[PDB]
Write a structure and sequence with these properties.
This protein is of the alpha+beta class and 47 residues long. Helix content is 15%, strand content 17%. It is classed as antimicrobial protein.
Amino acid sequence: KTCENLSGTFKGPCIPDGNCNKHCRNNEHLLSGRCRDDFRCWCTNRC
């Protein structure tokens, strides 16, 4: 896969709404696009 980190508690947050995939995928259009803060999702893209 490509550069992926979990957005949330560990290694950088994002958004507390829980809509992870739609976030990284809609605005940034990543590969896994799993963006949250209060919640934890892995966004994947090429760094």
